[PDB]
Design a protein around this ligand. Structure first.
Ligand SMILES: *[C@@H]1O[C@H](CO)[C@@H](O[C@@H]2O[C@H](CO)[C@@H](O[C@@H]3O[C@H](CO[C@H]4O[C@H](CO[C@H]5O[C@H](CO)[C@@H](O)[C@H](O)[C@@H]5O)[C@@H](O)[C@H](O[C@H]5O[C@H](CO)[C@@H](O)[C@H](O)[C@@H]5O)[C@@H]4O)[C@@H](O)[C@H](O[C@H]4O[C@H](CO)[C@@H](O)[C@H](O)[C@@H]4O[C@H]4O[C@H](CO)[C@@H](O)[C@H](O)[C@@H]4O[C@H]4O[C@H](CO)[C@@H](O)[C@H](O)[C@@H]4O)[C@@H]3O)[C@H](O)[C@H]2NC(C)=O)[C@H](O)[C@H]1NC(C)=O
Ligand SMILES: *[C@@H]1O[C@H](CO)[C@@H](O[C@@H]2O[C@H](CO)[C@@H](O[C@@H]3O[C@H](CO)[C@@H](O)[C@H](O)[C@H]3NC(C)=O)[C@H](O)[C@H]2NC(C)=O)[C@H](O)[C@H]1NC(C)=O
Ligand SMILES: *[C@@H]1O[C@H](CO)[C@@H](O[C@@H]2O[C@H](CO)[C@@H](O[C@@H]3O[C@H](CO)[C@@H](O)[C@H](O)[C@@H]3O)[C@H](O)[C@H]2NC(C)=O)[C@H](O)[C@H]1NC(C)=O
Ligand SMILES: *[C@@H]1O[C@H](CO)[C@@H](O[C@@H]2O[C@H](CO)[C@@H](O[C@@H]3O[C@H](CO)[C@@H](O)[C@H](O)[C@@H]3O)[C@H](O)[C@H]2NC(C)=O)[C@H](O)[C@H]1NC(C)=O
Ligand SMILES: *[C@@H]1O[C@H](CO)[C@@H](O[C@@H]2O[C@H](CO)[C@@H](O)[C@H](O)[C@H]2NC(C)=O)[C@H](O)[C@H]1NC(C)=O
Ligand code: IYJ
Ligand code: NAG
Ligand code: NAG
Lengths: 106, 254, 117, 217, 298, 298, 254
């Protein structure tokens, strides 16, 4: 069973600055690590299909990095709607998710 | 007279013949009986882990569409009709390079019967793959197979069986190899399962014990005679050192 | 295109509960269907997956036996049935299909199972 | 649909035997070649293997259409059904296209009648290696090609500016040699059947010295 | 003559069918679900940097033109209709010379489900180039790729995908290991995109991880070489008065070192750099020569 | 309109002709008159137990359906007509690899005489199996056969025969002797019946009698061997005091016997029983070793 | 326009044509002019006794049927038309295996002149059998031949000749084999008689001479060197029996 380690467990940042996330894979997963946004009291919404490929309807500020095990999601200018719970999940094997990352404004 | 008759029989038959569909397409599976007459086993090779063999591969099934009730005889049609007739999709899984002989024409047979039976023969030569466990080499008995299977049709579309049981395979007892000796052979019927479905399988295998005596004279005779000529060094007196050194090192380099 | 589910349910512990997930705008046989639970302020957890074209099914090694997934090829519906539930599995259950690169592009609306006396 | 109607209209009244502008002008053919790899360069047979995606494009007024689609992208199924130039590699000891899982050929047809035919080849090309100064020797030897039957007056070839394109050059099987550059030439050769436009692509291959130190010196 | 219904169905399906246009040409992108089942992993030719592999290359897509309504729900077909209908032109990016086995008939399989799904499988032996880094020979390991994708159809038109979970897609048979030098440790699939002058193309990569077996190279080179160094070494126990015995022992030693060296070097592919076995042979030969020249100055 | 009459004649000829029915299918047998002309008798391989032969294989039979009448009595036709007309399915029983050359066109001929006689001659190289008993090597004589019959047409349906006298049917060209190691003494035809699982067939047998040339193994093996036994016999004329001289003589004799024996063992082919050359090398080594042990006793 | 004109002319020419019948089927034999441009000779094999020759084989005859007058130019038609036009069945008697190169298409030419002349070029690499006397090896001059002949058509139905006399063959002077050197080449026209009839034959021949500059310093110098090395024993005194016998028998061994 592949386990995903996602960091940092919570954070806080101001509007309009670079923010980078991280998801680590115990075993190998090629490019099959998907990132999902979940606003509070909303269903998850897919951003990044596979490693580093934007989904339809996503803005251009979002972008991810691909590798064998180390996966990072970066955002440029951050607007005020990004307060939401961001999860990483693999699909090379039977699908598994990480702990998630909670974005806050301060 | 009897030509105009055979001509019209072959034409009404092949007229409206649908090559794409097997006999009894929505019906029960079609049985196919096999016969093999082995012509030769050319070379069992260990550098490549294969053996080349030749056979008269024959198949026999029952196509109801090819039924005729006017002319009373069996018809050996020319081999170029076979591409206009349903033949089962028989393949050998463990072949590496294979061919049907193409001289003077394509060495293939086609033969109909009044009841609807067909007999489809081929002179095939395959380079089947045989993995050989050389741990007990050269006193070893290898077991090399030819695995006959259906490609496109599952085990609910074509059934395979050995036509004639243990007499289905003939000519095994006239194959002489310079390196092995065919001890026996077995004919196994089986059903394999893959992701797409189950399919029929038949196996023909040979226990190839290695012929002894050549390897004795090629290696064991040289090994013993080198070690025997090594031991005259002690018969040579220890005062003369150069001759003993030359003798021993000649043994080692040889 | 869009996945609808049943509403929230209030059940006693030790009982059995059956969730529905109906698909519209496409046909379930061409893609896998997944069932995921999310606890209140914890991360996502994958339950299992069903192949509607074949009926083959696989389960998480902590959901085997407890949860069973079935499908109805007429209604374009994926069914999750759970046998016996304790007083910890009160969570929102999401239904999703595989997307382009084996990613869950389309998800359900979420069904919160709740447990009390 | 409508693409089927367009194709059935195109091939109507089409001969694949008469090149375009058969009695009007020569057919200018622009050629490009991506080098997937250069195989071993052995001096025993004075040859080298290469692997490329050969590409050709020309203008053919017969395959002209008016519709809302601008490029039709097709398999190798029509490579027999339309006029293909008879390009051949003049210094090829052996050469065959690739046929697994389908004939590795491309065909694309633009609104103005332009065509782009492209295929994958392994070419077993010959070249002499002046084996003096070995193993500090440099060789730069060609992959020539031209049309077989069509003289200069019927098919004229030409290079694009970004015609030849080498790849990573690290997966290449040039063990004894190191790729240092390439160049493209064009000239007219006299032949008994007529004059022909010949294009050559010289791969500069300086041998890299130091293996033969441990081997022999 | 119950087959009249089925031949009517097939003739209806092929009436007006155009196998030159991909399914859903002006509507959507053709999604091809690919699979591989390795029946036998062939021998790895180290000298040519290639390897052989036998596979039941399996594919599936959806053509809406080939829907039908009949008594049977899956049409299992004679495999010559694959020429009569559209199939994707998948080719192996690193395939050197592969063959589709035609014995007895074309080893091909075509099934058409009721909904229009297709399942086109083929048997074939791939011969693909495996670029090797033989610095650590014979303690080396390789990830020999197998990359394939569509010729002439871009990412916007034909996109490839795995049929099952990517960890469980490329399956190797249990006894399907024809290797004798290497061992097969595991599989590794990956799906990616390659940019080119004609456009973008989907590429599915499969890496097979191999580790060379040291058992034969221990016997061929290292053990004879250690014994030969010891054979140099027992010269020093010999005395200084019997100079002819010691000098002939030394010159015989450097002779067997030379023949062992070229014998070891013939086995490997010719490479432009020094390997671990080459360093071992060079160091141990330096010890042999050092012993000889020390005897000479003694 | 010069050739229009001939076009009309041929179109009338093939109108209603079925090439799938042997001439006389439901009435008579088909008598085939065969002839062979060996343009070159290729080299014989003894490791593989095979040999190559280049021939103009000739056949002839009567087909009543192909009668004509016109401005010519013989319609020498191109090779492509042979496909359009029935021809027998002859094949070589012991043929391993036979190739029908088709450079620049198919090397085939067809002559239709108005009475209906046919003469369908082909060019083809045949590689055929020659089982050899290599006990008398290199003084062995073989009769390497070339059998051929018909696939699938039993003796009741197709029967073969020679067109000329059997002693003057298999004709060998004056300069067709491509044998480098074997000498062709003569040809030998024979006809007979076999039985298989399908029925009885006519087999037309040929035998090429070969004798190996012993002119190279004398100088390669026997003369150096005999001269070395004589050199081993020079030891008995030396005085016993030169012990280093006589022992270097002896050990060199055994070593050169090992070299010549291993050299001759690859010259003689892969085989499972003792040959004449193996008996000779064994006896020569036995005499050398007996000289060695006699030196040891003295 | 020109394109439509060439279209209707070619469609007229191929319509009503019979590939079966040679030009002037009932008339005199057809004159076939032949050119060969030799691109490369290689692999002159001593063990296999053949040699690989790459050439642009070219033929030229006249067919009155393929005559046009409306369009004053030479029509180089696409190579796929060669299937649909009569060409003579020229073959090489002494070839072992040959092939027309097939990249990017079949390397083949069809050119029709306004007078009816056809011009049918091909690119062949042929492994011609060349039987070689090695009695005087390595100072031996060899005679390799390419025997060109028609299979089906007798000498009263076809007629060969060399187009352009001794200019029929070109490029021999540019060939540089590794071991040999092309000293002379000859063009011979004659007729051969077989049992089936008489045929025309053209023979292309090369007189290969071998270069001895390698064979001296490889084979002949070591033998003379070892002979002198054996001769040096006589200057050694008879006392040094061990040295003399060791040196002599080492000369025998090497
Ligand atoms: C001496 O004798 C020997 C032996 O008899 C002769 O050698 C034979 O020569 C012929 C003619 O040159 C060859 O036939 C053609 O082969 C090519 C493919 O060759 C490659 O693949 C062969 C194996 O076949 C594989 O592909 C075919 C594809 O049809 C498939 O059916 C089969 O199951 C298998 O998957 C290899 O054997 C071959 O290697 C050999 O041949 C090479 C030839 O160039 C040579 O270089 C090699 O060294 C080697 O010797 C090679 O790898 C076929 O593409 C071709 O078929 C097309 O063209 C003919 C004629 O126009 C046409 O009738 C066909 O229908 C087909 O045309 C369709 O497909 C085209 C694809 O490019 C397309 O462009 C067309 O528009 C057309 O499309 C239509 O039909 C398709 C269905 O076909 C349909 O889907 C479309 O929608 C559309 O309706 C020929 O079959 C033999 O292969 C070759 N055999 C051997 C053993 O060498 C030799 O020539 C003789 N020499 C002399 C001087 O006489
Ligand atoms: C692999 O095996 C296949 C079947 O066993 C072969 O398929 C055969 O190819 C032949 C080559 O063209 C076909 O011949 C054609 O037959 C039709 C019949 O109607 C004629 O019109 C054509 O003129 C004729 N071809 C020629 C050039 O004259 C066979 O019909 C065809 N048979 C089947 C059942 O499909 C493959 O060719 C073979 N491939 C190899 C060996 O590479
Ligand atoms: C060559 O190798 C094959 C492969 O292992 C051997 O074939 C195997 O032989 C055994 C015993 O003869 C078979 O066992 C049978 O199993 C069936 C299963 O239902 C059982 O009903 C029978 O009573 C019998 O026990 C086995 O199936 C068969 N095939 C395999 C393992 O694939 C063969 O014996 C070897 N030797 C020769 C000379 O062929
Ligand atoms: C290599 O070998 C060939 C093979 O024979 C040699 O060909 C021979 O060439 C001579 C010289 O032209 C031919 O002699 C001619 O004979 C005719 C017979 O009518 C005569 O009229 C001529 O005046 C001439 O004398 C000879 O026939 C021919 N051999 C054969 C079998 O036809 C060739 O000369 C050799 N040398 C070279 C360099 O090729
Ligand atoms: C390949 O051929 C092209 C076409 O001739 C060459 O392009 C020329 O490049 C020079 C500069 O190097 C320009 O001055 C010319 O105008 C270009 N010609 C065209 C038609 O664009 C190209 O340089 C060649 N490449 C090599 C390496 O020889
Ligand atoms: N320039 C350029 N051209 N073509 C390619 C390319 C495209 C599809 C498939 C493959 Cl195998 C390659 Cl190599 C590339 N990667 N780069
Ligand atoms: C046809 O062959 C079968 C099997 O050999 C045989 O029993 C039968 O008698 C034959 N037909 C006739 C009419 O003789
Ligand atoms: C056609 O070819 C012949 C022979 O090469 C030549 O004399 C003639 O001029 C050519 N035709 C044209 C229009 O140039």
């Amino acid at each position: 069973n592949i386990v995903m380690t996602q960091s940092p467990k919570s954070m806080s940042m101001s509007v309009g600055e670079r923010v980078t996330l991280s998801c680590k894979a115990s075993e190998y997963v090629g490019t099959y690590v998907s990132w999902y946004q979940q606003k509070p009291e909303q269903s998850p919404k897919l951003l990044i299909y596979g490693a580093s490929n934007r989904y339809t309807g996503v803005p251009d500020r979002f972008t991810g990095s691909g590798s064998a095990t180390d996966f990072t999601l970066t955002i440029g200018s951050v607007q005020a709607e990004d307060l939401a719970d961001y999860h990483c999940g693999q699909s090379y094997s039977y699908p598994t998710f990480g702990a998630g990352t909670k974005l806050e404004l301060k | 007279s009897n030509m105009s008759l055979v001509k019209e029989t072959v034409d009404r038959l092949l007229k409206g013949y649908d090559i794409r569909l097997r006999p009894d397409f929505g019906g029960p599976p079609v049985a196919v009986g096999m016969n093999i007459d082995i012509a030769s086993i050319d070379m069992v090779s260990e550098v490549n882990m294969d053996y080349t063999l030749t056979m008269y591969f024959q198949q026999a099934w029952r196509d109801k569409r090819l039924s005729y009730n006017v002319i009373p005889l069996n018809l050996t049609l020319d081999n170029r009709v076979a591409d206009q007739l349903w033949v089962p999709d028989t393949y050998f899984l463990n072949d590496k390079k294979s061919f049907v002989h193409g001289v003077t024409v394509k060495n293939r047979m086609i033969r109909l019967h009044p009841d609807g039976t067909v007999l489809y023969g081929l002179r095939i030569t395959t380079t089947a793959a045989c993995m050989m466990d050389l741990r007990r080499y050269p006193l070893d008995e290898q077991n090399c197979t030819l695995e006959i299977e259906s490609y496109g049709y599952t085990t609910d579309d074509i059934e395979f069986y050995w036509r004639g049981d243990d007499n289905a395979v003939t000519g095994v007892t006239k194959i002489e190899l310079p390196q092995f000796s065919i001890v026996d052979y077995k004919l196994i019927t089986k059903k394999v399962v893959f992701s797409t479905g189950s399919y029929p399988r038949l196996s023909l295998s040979f226990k190839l014990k290695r012929n002894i005596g050549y390897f004795i004279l090629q290696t064991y005779m040289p090994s013993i005679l080198i070690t025997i000529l090594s031991w005259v060094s002690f018969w040579i007196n220890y005062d003369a050192s150069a001759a003993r050194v030359a003798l021993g090192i000649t043994t080692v380099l040889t | 295109v869009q996945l609808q589910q049943s509403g929230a349910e209030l059940v006693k512990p030790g009982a059995s509960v059956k969730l529905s997930c109906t698909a519209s705008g496409f046909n379930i046989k061409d893609t896998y269907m997944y069932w995921v639970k999310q606890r209140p302020e914890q991360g996502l957890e994958w339950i299992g997956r069903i192949d509607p074209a074949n009926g083959d099914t696989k389960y998480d090694p902590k959901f085997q036996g407890k949860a069973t997934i079935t499908t109805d090829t007429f209604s374009n519906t994926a069914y999750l049935q759970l046998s016996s539930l304790t007083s910890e599995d009160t969570a929102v259950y999401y239904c999703a299909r595989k997307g382009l690169r084996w990613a869950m592009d389309y998800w359900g609306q979420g069904t919160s199972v709740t447990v009390s006396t | 649909g409508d693409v089927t109607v367009i194709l059935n209209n195109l091939l109507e009244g089409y001969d694949n035997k008469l090149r375009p502008d058969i009695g009007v002008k020569p057919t200018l053919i622009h050629t490009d070649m991506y080098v997937n790899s250069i195989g071993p360069v052995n001096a025993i047979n004075m040859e080298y293997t290469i692997d490329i995606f050969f590409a050709q494009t020309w203008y053919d007024r017969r395959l002209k259409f008016n519709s809302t689609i601008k490029v039709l992208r097709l398999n190798s199924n029509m490579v027999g059904k339309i006029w293909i130039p008879d390009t051949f590699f003049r210094n090829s000891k052996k050469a065959d296209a690739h046929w697994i899982t389908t004939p590795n050929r491309m065909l694309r047809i633009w609104n103005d009648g332009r065509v782009l035919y492209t295929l994958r080849l392994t070419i077993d090309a010959e070249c002499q290696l002046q084996l003096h100064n070995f193993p500090m020797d440099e060789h730069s030897c060609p992959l020539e090609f031209s049309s077989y039957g069509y003289p200069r007056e019927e098919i004229v070839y030409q290079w694009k500016r970004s015609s030849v394109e080498v790849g990573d050059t690290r997966s290449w099987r040039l063990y004894q040699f190191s790729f240092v550059g390439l160049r493209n030439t064009t000239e007219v050769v006299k032949t008994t059947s007529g004059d022909y436009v010949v294009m050559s692509v010289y791969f500069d291959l300086s041998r890299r010295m130091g293996y033969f130190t441990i081997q022999t010196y | 003559d119950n087959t009249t219904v089925f031949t009517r169905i097939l003739d209806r399906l092929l009436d007006g069918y155009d196998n030159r246009l991909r399914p859903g040409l002006g509507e959507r992108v053709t999604e091809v679900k690919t699979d591989i089942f390795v029946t036998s992993f062939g021998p790895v030719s180290d000298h040519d940097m290639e390897y052989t592999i036998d596979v039941f290359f399996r594919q599936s897509w959806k053509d809406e033109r080939l829907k039908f309504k009949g008594p049977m729900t899956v049409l299992r077909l004679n495999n010559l209709m694959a020429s009569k209908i559209w199939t994707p032109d998948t080719f192996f990016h690193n395939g050197k010379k592969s063959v589709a086995h035609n014995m007895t008939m074309p080893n091909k399989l075509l099934r058409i489900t009721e909904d229009g799904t297709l399942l086109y499988t083929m048997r074939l032996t791939v011969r693909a180039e495996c670029p090797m880094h033989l610095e650590d020979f014979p303690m080396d390991a390789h990830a020999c790729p197998l990359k394939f994708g569509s010729y002439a159809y871009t990412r916007a038109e034909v996109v490839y995908e795995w049929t099952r979970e990517p960890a469980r897609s490329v399956v190797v048979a249990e006894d399907g290991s024809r290797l004798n030098q290497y061992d097969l440790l595991g599989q590794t699939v990956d799906s990616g995109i390659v940019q080119s002058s004609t456009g973008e193309y989907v590429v599915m990569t499969t890496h097979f991880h191999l580790k060379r077996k040291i058992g034969y190279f221990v016997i061929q080179t290292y053990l004879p070489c250690i014994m030969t160094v010891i054979l140099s070494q027992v010269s020093f126990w010999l005395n200084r008065e019997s100079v002819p015995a010691r000098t002939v022992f030394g010159v015989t030693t450097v002779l067997t070192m030379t023949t062992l060296s070229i014998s070891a070097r013939n086995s490997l592919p010719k490479v432009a750099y020094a390997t671990a076995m080459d360093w071992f042979i060079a160091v141990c030969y330096a010890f042999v020569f050092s012993a000889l020249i020390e005897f000479a100055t003694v």
